[PDB]
Design a protein around this ligand. Sequence first.
Ligand code: CLA
Ligand code: CLA
Ligand code: CLA
Ligand code: CLA
Ligand code: CLA
Ligand SMILES: CC(/C=C/C=C(C)/C=C/[C@@]12O[C@]1(C)C[C@@H](O)CC2(C)C)=C\C=C\C=C(C)\C=C\C=C(C)\C=C\[C@@]12O[C@]1(C)C[C@@H](O)CC2(C)C
Ligand SMILES: CC(/C=C/C=C(C)/C=C/[C@@]12O[C@]1(C)C[C@@H](O)CC2(C)C)=C\C=C\C=C(C)\C=C\C=C(C)\C=C\[C@@]12O[C@]1(C)C[C@@H](O)CC2(C)C
Ligand SMILES: CC(/C=C/C=C(C)/C=C/[C@@]12O[C@]1(C)C[C@@H](O)CC2(C)C)=C\C=C\C=C(C)\C=C\C=C(C)\C=C\[C@@]12O[C@]1(C)C[C@@H](O)CC2(C)C
Ligand SMILES: CC1=C(/C=C/C(C)=C/C=C/C(C)=C/C=C/C=C(C)/C=C/C=C(C)/C=C/C2=C(C)CCCC2(C)C)C(C)(C)CCC1
Ligand code: SF4
Lengths: 80, 34, 164, 201, 30, 735, 85
Amino acid sequence: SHTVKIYDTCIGCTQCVRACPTDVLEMVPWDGCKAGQIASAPRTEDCVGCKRCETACPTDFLSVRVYLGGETTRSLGLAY
Amino acid sequence: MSLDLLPSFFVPLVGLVLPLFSIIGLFLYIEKEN
Amino acid sequence: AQSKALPFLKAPAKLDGSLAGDFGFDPMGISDQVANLKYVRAAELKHCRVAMLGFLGWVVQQYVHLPGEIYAESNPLKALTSVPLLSQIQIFLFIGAIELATLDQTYTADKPWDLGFDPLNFSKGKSEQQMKDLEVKELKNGRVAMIAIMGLIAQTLYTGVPLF
Amino acid sequence: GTPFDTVSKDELAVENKAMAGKSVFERAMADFNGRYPAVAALGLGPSAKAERWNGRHAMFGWIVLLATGYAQAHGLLPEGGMDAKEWGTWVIVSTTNGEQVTIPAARAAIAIGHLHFGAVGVFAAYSKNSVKDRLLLEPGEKDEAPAGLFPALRPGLTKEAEMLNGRVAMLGLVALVAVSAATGQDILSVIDQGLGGLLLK
Amino acid sequence: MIYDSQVYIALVIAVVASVLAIRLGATLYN
Amino acid sequence: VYKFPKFSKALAEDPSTRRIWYGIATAHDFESHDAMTESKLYQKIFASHFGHIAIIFLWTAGNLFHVAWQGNFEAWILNPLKVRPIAHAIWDPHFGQAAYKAFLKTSSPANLALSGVYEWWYTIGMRTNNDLYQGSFFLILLSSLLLFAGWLHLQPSFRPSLDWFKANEYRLNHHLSGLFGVSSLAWTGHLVHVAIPESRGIHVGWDNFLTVLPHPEGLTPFFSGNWKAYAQNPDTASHIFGSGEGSGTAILTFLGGFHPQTKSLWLTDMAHHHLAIAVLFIVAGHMYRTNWLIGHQMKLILEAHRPPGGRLGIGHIGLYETITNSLHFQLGLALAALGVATSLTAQHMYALPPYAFLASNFPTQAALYTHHQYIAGFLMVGAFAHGAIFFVRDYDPAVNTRNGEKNVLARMLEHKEAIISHLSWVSLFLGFHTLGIYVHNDVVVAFGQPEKQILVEPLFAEWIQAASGKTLYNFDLLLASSNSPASVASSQLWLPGWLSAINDGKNSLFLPIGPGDFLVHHAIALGLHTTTLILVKGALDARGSKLMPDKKDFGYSFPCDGPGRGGTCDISAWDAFYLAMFWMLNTIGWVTFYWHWKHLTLWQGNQVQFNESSNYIMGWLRDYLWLNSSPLINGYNPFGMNSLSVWAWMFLFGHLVWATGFMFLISWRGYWQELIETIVWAHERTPLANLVRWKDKPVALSIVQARLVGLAHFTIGYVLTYAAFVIASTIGKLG
Amino acid sequence: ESTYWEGKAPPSVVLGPFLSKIPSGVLGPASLVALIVGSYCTHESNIFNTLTVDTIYPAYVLGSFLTPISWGLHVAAWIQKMNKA
Ligand code: CLA
Ligand code: CLA
Ligand code: CLA
Ligand code: CLA
Ligand code: CLA
Ligand SMILES: CC(/C=C/C=C(C)/C=C/[C@@]12O[C@]1(C)C[C@@H](O)CC2(C)C)=C\C=C\C=C(C)\C=C\C=C(C)\C=C\[C@@]12O[C@]1(C)C[C@@H](O)CC2(C)C
Ligand SMILES: CC(/C=C/C=C(C)/C=C/[C@@]12O[C@]1(C)C[C@@H](O)CC2(C)C)=C\C=C\C=C(C)\C=C\C=C(C)\C=C\[C@@]12O[C@]1(C)C[C@@H](O)CC2(C)C
Ligand SMILES: CC(/C=C/C=C(C)/C=C/[C@@]12O[C@]1(C)C[C@@H](O)CC2(C)C)=C\C=C\C=C(C)\C=C\C=C(C)\C=C\[C@@]12O[C@]1(C)C[C@@H](O)CC2(C)C
Ligand SMILES: CC1=C(/C=C/C(C)=C/C=C/C(C)=C/C=C/C=C(C)/C=C/C=C(C)/C=C/C2=C(C)CCCC2(C)C)C(C)(C)CCC1
Ligand code: SF4
């Protein structure tokens, strides 16, 4: 399964979570930004690696980073 | 058996039999489990 | 200082005490690279035994020959080519048969030179000091033979006189 | 060289006390089985199954060599060479000066007979569930126990009798090849000499 | 022209070099 | 599906066919294997080196055996200029009678030998098919030795440690002195003892070598210091090679130039060369410090080399630990040196042929030059790729930095933009203007007015030729003058031989050059600069850029970084190697095209055809490719076939593999995954085939794998088609 | 140790424990003498008299080797002079 990391440059704009096609990211409470929220990656087993999450990231060099790793039938997007 | 019969003895042997046994072994090995 | 053979040098670290025949003779420090002295002692003893047998065969072939004609060559180096390849390949196969089991044995054992060869039981009942003395005798004689067999080969290749 | 160790102390050989005693045959078998599993488990290599099968084949082949000598002596074994126009250029052996020396027809016929026997063997190999004695060892099956230096003296149609005769036939083939190579005559010539003359007569 | 003995023993020596190759191959592990 | 990539558990858990593909392509990347240490890495590399040397020796032994068994070496000895060497016999069941007849040579169909091994072995003193058999036997014995050593050094008590592997001074002392100097000394011994008398008709074999004196005086002059005695009475100008007629007694001489009969370097010249090289390398092998308190510690040498004014930063202080701890830095250095060395071999073995009767073997000359130049390009690209790998995975900025200031290597990443920008400027400059002049010549000649061509005389290169003694350009410079100090100095040592060879129209020594040579050399410079630009850009930008400032965290080879932020195709350092392989192939193609056309015109005699038509592109296309491709394509026609039929088949095969590479390069993934899904559905939903199901899920090749496969097809097709063309064209044009 | 340097001249340890103890007043004149001798030997073996097989003269050859050496001797002389030696 791929690896997804969140960095404290998160501004809690939720654009990553609402762009994930496989429900990998979610918004959790935080105290490091104005919005009081930070993205989390608790379901990386469903991560497919499409990187839509970081295409919607407005922070300078990203706050969500997807590191491709071992492959799985879920991560390979295999309907068969 | 003359020396000129060695090509006809070896070329089929190598170029057909060795592929067959090598394919058998490689397929068996790469299709193994744990 | 600690070398008996070269009373002025200090021997290397691995040359001490046990492994009879240890006279501190390793000026080049070859023992510093080998992990232990087991394999090098096995090789030295194999060379010693082969050289003893070679010197004995050299002299005997100089004086005594088998009844057949193919063994009538007096020069050992000329007999190396005069003797039929069948005899030499049989000798080589016998040596290789002895050598493969000992090949498994040598690289792992604590005493690779101890092949268990004692048909006459010359070591049964001997004390530790007597056994060490026998080992020293064997090593001495083997080193002298090695020097001697190399000298015989050189003098036969350089003058054609196989002896004296 | 001197300021370091060429071989680390953690990588040192340990004497295998598990092979104490264990005459060279047992030691060699154990070393082969431990070093090469999945081919030892199949019965291949220095194994009693392989020895039995090779002994059977050696006896049958002593019979085949006698038959071949008889056929050569008695005017059988067709004459000439194969037809290159009929069987392609793969049967051509050499072209000395404008003539094509082909594979002898006798060699082709003997190869066809050996193909018959080898095909029978291949069928028996891929017929494991219907043959009395299989070629390879089943997973779980254990190799029959080595017979030793001298197998038991049990006359008749016994495992020991077949074992002894197979060993004898294989040794005879080894001796025949050694005599032919050392002296320089044909294999059938050596068999003829070793039968007095009653084969190629 | 080389003889049958010359080619035969070269083939036999080549076999020995083959057994040494698989021993190195198997020692470099599966 | 749980035990093929034993070295990688991540791959072994892949349920798709990608596991098998990646298992092959990651087998030799030992540093990335599971449960990996440095000691195991060096030990495995050591054993692999032993196996590799064994493979090389077995290959040489096979060549020797097949020349001895199925060749015509003995017949070629008696008539080297008319008898064509035979590589090995052919037994192919698919042959028709016509193919058998056409390939028939003496007793069996056989392949002509284009490796030049006949001339090489003849020069070093081989005259019998039993001498070759002895060499094959000895080489198989050496291969057995190396295999045994490789097995032995994986045993527990014989596995070397990291300190032994990283002992730089010991390895350098031994490599230099022992390997180079002592191997040169032994080669001089063989050259003299065997080769020198064998060229003079005296047989020196493994029987009469302890009793046949290489020199009549016999080691007396060497110890006495009268070393001139070994140079007295050299081979005359009427010496027949391999025979005692007109021979001499000297063993070490300066003669220069070529043998008047074989048109190759004097054997006594090469023996003296190897003796001098042996002495020099044995001397140079005592430089570095070992257990006897004298020598050099290269760490101190590197650290002490900082310019005092300060322009290289802190110097080379951190380079010792950088190189020692990285196997990719050393591999890149070795590959670059080997590439330069084999380029040197290619450039010198045609200008200065070292083997008897090799100058008149035109197909083997072309094959050797092309082979060595292609190997050179491969080695250079590999050196740069491993430099990039070192940057990605072995480079440590902390080691190469002392108190903020950066060492000589770390400073290469500071002006990396300057380096890349200037490489780009040079590449654009050369490309723009070389193409401009070529197209100007194309248009001007096409319009029927060739006098308006822009033809620049290569005066700088012709100046060098005159400096070495060529009196063809009327420069009267250094050796073209008999009064210059350069000429008076060697007027008694090697000028008469050298001048007689350089000033000869039948040699390839310093071929006469014109405007076509100028333009093609500028094309070669453009190719070199562009390949260097791609490789250097990939190496320096390997650790990151503006588009990917964390590229080092993704490794040397990864597909991309995604679809956003613009795009991100071919952004990895591996992709820079992949792109530079095309430019290396193009540059080597230009070099080999130039060499082959120049030598085809020289051998055929119509050197005016090259000098006139080489200045414009259509000249190349019409007079090299279209003209010399006629014999090759008519290797088989609807009327018959020739022994060149195999070369035409290889020509078409290379074209096919090239275009399959085009498949794998133009069409990317994603288009092949959906098609594979359709095929999977078809197999799953069809009777009589549902009984058979795959164990690994069939998936499309990965992006990096697809790039590799397309590059492999491109390169294999390129090499095969050009080898077929050059060989068949030379054979069919020059008889 | 610590052959690394950043001042005006390197420490005398870079000359080895044989040249580190030579006074600069010895190395300097020795370097000049070696350079002159090597240049003369080179100009006597060649240039002034053309080389020949019969005329090699190990003195001129060995001599000529003092020219490359001279370079090192005067470099060491400067290093010693700047290090108050
Ligand atoms: C080194 C490689 C190699 C070798 C030696 C051969 C050899 C051969 N090929 Mg072949 N081939 C190869 C690679 C090779 N191929 C590859 C890679 C391809 C794909 C590009 C092809 C594609 C190809 C085609 C398309 C055809 C051949 C054919 C042939 C046969 C030549 C025609 C002839 O006169 O025989 C005549 C053949 C016979 C009289 C009978 C031969 C039948 C087999 C080969 C005999 C094997 C005996 C075997 C030991 C039996 C085992 C026991 C069994 C009874 C249980 C010959 C056996 C032709 C052929 O014969 O087709 C069968 C043919 O049509 N080949
Ligand atoms: C690497 C060297 C090399 C190469 C490329 C070849 C190539 C060839 N040999 Mg050959 N050969 C070699 C060495 C080599 N030989 C040596 C050293 C010997 C002496 C034993 C022979 C003896 C020999 C004979 C007797 C015959 C050939 C034949 C042939 C041709 C058909 C292939 C064949 O039947 O092989 C058979 C080869 C052998 C039985 C000998 C083994 C070859 C070497 C020792 C193994 C090299 C392995 C290599 C390094 C890597 C292996 C990769 C592997 C793991 C996949 C082919 C041109 C045949 C021929 O001429 O047909 C026209 C033929 O009849 N060879
Ligand atoms: C005298 C002792 C000696 C000798 C002969 C060797 C020899 C060798 N060692 Mg070695 N080694 C030694 C001592 C020695 N070593 C010591 C003491 C150590 C420990 C410090 C090592 C540690 C060591 C390692 C760790 C490895 C080796 C390896 C090798 C092999 C290199 C591969 C090869 O075949 O190259 C053959 C090369 C030649 C015959 C010569 C090449 C000729 C060049 C290319 C031409 C250059 C000419 C010119 C300069 C070109 C430029 C033109 C000019 C104008 C600039 C080679 C057999 C490697 C190997 O393969 O292991 C099996 C390896 O991995 N050695
Ligand atoms: C002695 C030289 C040498 C050595 C020791 C290495 C060693 C290494 N290289 Mg390297 N390399 C070299 C030369 C060398 N290379 C050269 C010359 C180039 C330029 C072409 C490269 C380019 C290169 C790249 C781009 C990469 C490496 C990598 C690696 C590492 C892993 C290798 C691997 O996985 O193999 C895998 C082996 C294969 C995939 C087999 C490929 C076989 C090719 C396709 C040829 C086979 C086709 C054949 C010709 C068939 C003929 C067709 C017929 C019809 C005629 C390893 C440390 C990789 C790495 O990760 O390094 C850390 C990596 O990414 N190297
Ligand atoms: C010469 C180069 C070349 C070749 C051979 C092909 C071949 C093919 N392309 Mg194409 N393609 C090419 C260049 C080429 N392409 C380029 C440059 C592009 C870039 C735009 C594409 C883009 C492209 C797309 C987008 C598609 C194809 C498709 C296809 C396939 C059509 C089905 C077919 O005929 O399969 C049969 C195979 C052949 C005709 C190839 C030769 C096979 C020989 C003649 C017969 C078998 C030989 C035998 C098995 C050999 C065995 C021996 C061996 C093991 C040693 C076929 C594999 C389509 C596809 O997926 O297939 C439906 C498809 O959708 N291609
Ligand atoms: C053979 C030998 C010893 C052999 C002993 C054997 C086999 C013992 C075997 C056993 O004990 C075991 C192992 C185990 C027991 O349970 C069983 C037996 C079987 C009992 C020693 C030779 C030892 C041989 C020696 C020391 C030889 C020295 C030779 C010299 C000095 C020669 C010099 C010259 O040859 C030159 C150099 C040049 C010539 O021209 C001039 C001269 C002078 C002739
Ligand atoms: C001699 C022999 C093996 C000898 C092995 C020895 C000494 C091993 C010694 C070691 O193990 C020890 C002791 C200890 C180990 O640590 C070390 C070593 C040294 C390794 C095998 C012969 C083996 C001989 C064999 C297997 C013969 C097989 C013959 C067959 C199958 C018959 C075939 C035919 O019938 C056909 C097929 C058709 C007919 O036309 C033709 C014919 C030929 C008649
Ligand atoms: C067993 C054998 C053949 C057995 C054949 C059988 C079973 C055939 C069975 C059949 O069903 C078939 C298959 C097919 C049916 O249609 C026919 C029958 C008949 C029904 C041959 C052995 C053949 C055995 C031979 C040839 C042995 C040769 C031995 C030699 C030379 C020994 C030499 C030495 O003994 C000395 C001299 C001195 C010692 O110190 C050293 C050595 C070397 C050991
Ligand atoms: C990336 C990288 C890398 C790589 C690199 C490379 C690959 C490089 C290349 C390089 C090269 C490839 C170089 C070349 C060089 C050359 C030279 C430098 C030459 C010189 C020459 C000379 C100097 C000569 C002279 C002369 C003349 C001219 C005349 C005659 C005589 C004389 C000799 C005088 C590495 C790994 C390292 C590291 C990391 C980074
Ligand atoms: S890849 Fe990016 S987008 Fe696709 S799931 Fe994993 S996180 Fe959400």
